[PDB]
A = this chain, B = another copy of it.
Amino acid sequence: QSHADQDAYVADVDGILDVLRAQVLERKPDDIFQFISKSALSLQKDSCDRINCKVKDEQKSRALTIIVFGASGDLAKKKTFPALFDLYCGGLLPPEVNIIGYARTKVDDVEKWKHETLMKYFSNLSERGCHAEDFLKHISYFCGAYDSVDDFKRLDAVIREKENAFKGPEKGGNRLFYLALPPSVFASVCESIHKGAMPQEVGGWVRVIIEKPFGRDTKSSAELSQALEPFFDESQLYRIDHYLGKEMVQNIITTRFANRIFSAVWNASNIACVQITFKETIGTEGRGGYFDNIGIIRDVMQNHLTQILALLAMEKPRSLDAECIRDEKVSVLKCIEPITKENCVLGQYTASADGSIPGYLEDVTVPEGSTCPTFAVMRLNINNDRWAGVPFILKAGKAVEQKYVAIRIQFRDEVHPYGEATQRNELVIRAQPSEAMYVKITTKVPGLSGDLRQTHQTELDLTYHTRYDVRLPDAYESLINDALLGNSTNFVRKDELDVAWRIFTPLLHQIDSGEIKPIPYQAGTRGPKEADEFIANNGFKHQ
Contacts and interface: CB of A to CB of B under 8 A. Distances in A.
Contacts of A451: 485, 487
A487 B451 CA distance: 10
Interface string A22-57: 000000011111100000000000000000001000
Interface string A247-271: 1001101110111111111000110
Given A261-B411, A264-B264, A265-B265, A446 B466 contact: yes
Contacts of A247: 444, 446
Most chain B beta-carbon contacts within 10 A, residue among A90, A254, A447: A254
Copies of this chain present in the complex amount to 2
Interface in A205-240: none
Contact of A439 (B261, B458, B463): B261
B421 A258 contact: yes
Interface string A191-205: 000000000000000
Given A270-B264, A411-B260, A414-B258, A473 B448 contact: yes
Interface of chain A, helix or strand or loop or mixed? loop
A445 B464 contact: yes
Interface in A397-446: 411-414, 416-418, 421-422, 424-425, 439, 441-446
Given A258-B418, A259-B425, A263-B414, A441 B462 contact: yes
Contacts of A464: 30, 443-446, 456, 458
A477 B448 CA distance: 9
B261 A425 contact: yes
Identify the 8 closest CB pairs spanning chains A and B, nearest first. A250-B444, A258-B442, A258-B422, A260-B411, A31-B465, A458-B464, A258-B418, A443-B464
17 contacts: A29-B465, A30-B467, A247-B446, A258-B414, A258-B422, A259-B414, A260-B270, A261-B270, A316-B417, A320-B418, A320-B452, A439-B460, A446-B466, A447-B470, A458-B462, A458-B463, A460-B460
